[PDB]
Amino acid sequence: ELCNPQDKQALLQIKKDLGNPTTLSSWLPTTDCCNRTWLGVLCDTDTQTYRVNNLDLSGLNLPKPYPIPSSLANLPYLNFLYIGGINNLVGPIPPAIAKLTQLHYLYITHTNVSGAIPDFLSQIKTLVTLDFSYNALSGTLPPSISSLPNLVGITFDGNRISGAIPDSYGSFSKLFTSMTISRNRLTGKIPPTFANLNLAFVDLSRNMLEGDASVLFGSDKNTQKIHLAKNSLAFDLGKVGLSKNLNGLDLRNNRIYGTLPQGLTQLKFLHSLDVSFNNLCGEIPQGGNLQRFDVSAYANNKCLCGSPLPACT
Amino acid sequence: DPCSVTEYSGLATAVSSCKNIVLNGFQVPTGKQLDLSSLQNDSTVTFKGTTTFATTADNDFNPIVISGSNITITGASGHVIDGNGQAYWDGKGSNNQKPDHFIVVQKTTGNSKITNLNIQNWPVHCFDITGSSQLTISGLILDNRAGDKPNAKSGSLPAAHNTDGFDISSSDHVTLDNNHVYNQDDCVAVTSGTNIVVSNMYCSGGHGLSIGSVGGKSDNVVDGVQFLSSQVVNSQNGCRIKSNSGATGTINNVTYQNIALTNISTYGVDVQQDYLNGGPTGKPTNGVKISNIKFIKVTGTVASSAQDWFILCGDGSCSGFTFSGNAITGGGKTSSCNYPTNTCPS
C-alpha cells in the first residue's frame, strides 16, 4: 500500500479515541488510506513520501463527548489539520499538538474546546495560520505567538478571551496580514505597537475595547477591511489616513468623534461603510462612493449633514 | 380564501395562517417585499400566473425573501416570475440603485425545496442562499438573456451585469440540481459552505462554476463541494477557484467532474490566489489553503482567446490536486500553472 503503516495505525487509533464514529466508516483497516476513499485523509503527493499530511475532521456527530485525541501526535507529517463543526469535541487544546513540528495550517473551530489558547503553539515555527474561532476558549491572549516567523493570520473570533491585547502583538512579521478576534471580552486599548503591522483585514468588533484606534489606519497601509464595531473606541476620525485598497469600513456603535476624513472620497473600491451610532460631526465628504450609501450608514451621529443626509445649513 | 393570494395586500394574512398558499400572479408594489420569511413548518407556496415587481431603485432592497423549515416553494405550468430587471440595468451592475439580491433564501432548514420556478429579468444577483441546511433547489430556469444586449443606459456594454445565478454562503447540505442559468456572471458561486452538491447544471453566458472569492468575509471555509455532470457554454470561465490576497481561510475537497465546455472566453480552468478588489495582482499569498481539488473529465473546446488552464497558487498553500481524463482544448494563449508542477495538463 501507499499508506505508511504507522500513519494507518494512528488514524485508526484516532477513530477509536473518538468512539469509532459512524461518520468515519470509510476508514477501513483493510483499505489503503492513501487512495482518497478515507474521508478527510490526504497523503503527500508533492514529496511523494505519501505520508498523511492533510487531515480534515468535520461534522463527526460524536455519540458521547471526547477530547482531542493525543494520538494526533503519531501523524508527524501533518501539514494541514482541520477539526471543525463537532459539538461533542470538548476539553483543552492538548500538548500533543506541539509534536506536529511540520504543521502549517491549524483549525479547531465550531467545537466545544475550552481552556486557554496555549503558549506552546509558539514552538511550532512552521505555522502559517491559526483558526480557533467559535469554541469556548477563555483566559487571555498568549503573547508568545507573536514570535512565530511564518504566521500570516490569526482567527480567534467568538470565544471568551479576556484581558488586554498584548503589546507583543505588534511584533508579527511583515507576512502577517489578517487579525480577527471579534466577539470576545477584550478590554483596554489597542497597543501603539500595532503601528508596526500592515493588515489586509482586521476585525476586533464586539469587544470592550477603549480609546484610540488610529494606529490601524494609514495611507501607507495595504488594508482591505477594518471592522471595529461595538466597542467603546474614541478618537478623532478626521485625522486618519486611508489605504487605497480599503473596500470596507465598519466603525458602528463606538464613541468616535470629529469629521469624516476627505480622503474617503478618493477610495475607489469602498463598497461597505457603516459609521452609525458614533459622535461624528460635520459635512459628509461629497465624492467617491459616499453618496451611494443609505442614510442608515451615517445615522445616529452628533451633527453630521450632507448627502445622503439633509444638506448642511 | 385567505390562502389564495390575488393581490399583495392578502399576502401577510396567508403567510401567518396558511400551510398551503397560492400566489396567483400579481405586481408587488414599490418598496414592498414578497415576504415569505415567516412560513409555517411544512408549508407549500405555489406560484401561478405572472408575478411582477414595481420599480424600487434601492441597493439594499430585497424583493423576495424565503425562510422556514420543511417548506416547499414551487411553480405551476405557465407561471412566470419577472424581476423588473429592465428598469435597473445600466451596464454596471453592483457598482443607479438596483436591488442587489433578488431572492434571499435564509435560515431555510429541514429538507426544504425550491423547485420548477421560471424566473426572468432579475436586477443583479438572483439567489443568495445563506444560513441554510438540507435544502434542494431543482428544475429552475433563470433567463436573463434580455440583459445581454445594450440598453439606453449601458452605452456599449451589456445592460445586465453581476447577475450571479446562485450565491451560497454559511450553508450545509445544499443541493443545486438540474437548473438552467442564462446570465452575465457566476452561474454558481460558493464563498463558504460544506457538503454542497451542484449537479446537472446548464450554465450559459456567465462566468462559470466558481468557488470564491474566498477570504476576508464572515465565513471563509469551503469544505466538500461537488460540481458534477454539467455544461458551461459561452462563458468567461469554465471551472474557477479564487482566493483573496492577504486573507486567511480554507478551500477543501472540491471536485469538478464530467464538465463539458463550449466557447469559454478566458480560462478553461482558473485557480488563483491573488485577487484584490475584483482584480488579479500577480502576487498570490498563502493564507488561504486549497487542498484536495479534483478535475475529472473536464472536456470540450474553449475559444481561441482563452488559456485552457491557469493555476497561480501561493507558496505552500496548495495541496493535493488530481487530474484525470481532462481534455480542455482550443486555447490560443499558452496555459500557465505553478502547481502541482510548472506544466499544465493542456
Ligand SMILES: *[C@@H]1O[C@H](CO[C@@H]2O[C@@H](C)[C@@H](O)[C@@H](O)[C@@H]2O)[C@@H](O[C@@H]2O[C@H](CO)[C@@H](O)[C@H](O)[C@H]2NC(C)=O)[C@H](O[C@@H]2O[C@@H](C)[C@@H](O)[C@@H](O)[C@@H]2O)[C@H]1NC(C)=O
Ligand atoms: C417547527 O419545526 C421545528 C423543526 O425541527 C423539527 O424537529 C422534529 C420535531 C422533526 O419534525 C424534524 O423533522 C424537524 O426538523 C421544531 O423545532 C424542533 O422541535 C423539537 C421538538 O421535539 C426539538 O426536539 C428540536 O430540537 C427542535 N428543533 C429546532 C431547530 O428548534 C418546532 O418545534 C417548536 O420549537 C421547539 C424548540 C419546541 O418548543 C417545540 O415543542 C415547538 O413546537 C416546530 N414548530 C412548530 C410550531 O410546530
Ligand SMILES: *[C@@H]1O[C@H](CO)[C@@H](O[C@@H]2O[C@H](CO)[C@@H](O[C@@H]3O[C@H](CO)[C@@H](O)[C@H](O)[C@@H]3O)[C@H](O)[C@H]2NC(C)=O)[C@H](O)[C@H]1NC(C)=O
Ligand atoms: C457545545 O455543545 C452544546 C450542546 O451540545 C451546543 O449547544 C447548542 O447551542 C446552540 C446555540 O446556542 C443551541 O441552539 C438553539 O436551539 C434552540 C432549539 O433547541 C433554538 O430554538 C434556538 O433558537 C437556538 O438555535 C442548541 O439548542 C444547543 N443545544 C443544546 C442541546 O442545548 C453548543 O453550540 C456547542 N458549542 C459551544 C461553543 O458551546
Ligand SMILES: *[C@@H]1O[C@H](CO)[C@@H](O[C@@H]2O[C@H](CO)[C@@H](O)[C@H](O)[C@H]2NC(C)=O)[C@H](O)[C@H]1NC(C)=O
Ligand atoms: C414535510 O412537509 C410535507 C409537506 O410538504 C409533509 O408532507 C405531508 O404530510 C401530510 C401528513 O402526513 C400528508 O397528508 C401530505 O400528503 C404530505 N404532503 C406531501 C407533499 O407529501 C411532511 O410530512 C413533512 N415532513 C416532516 C418530517 O415533517
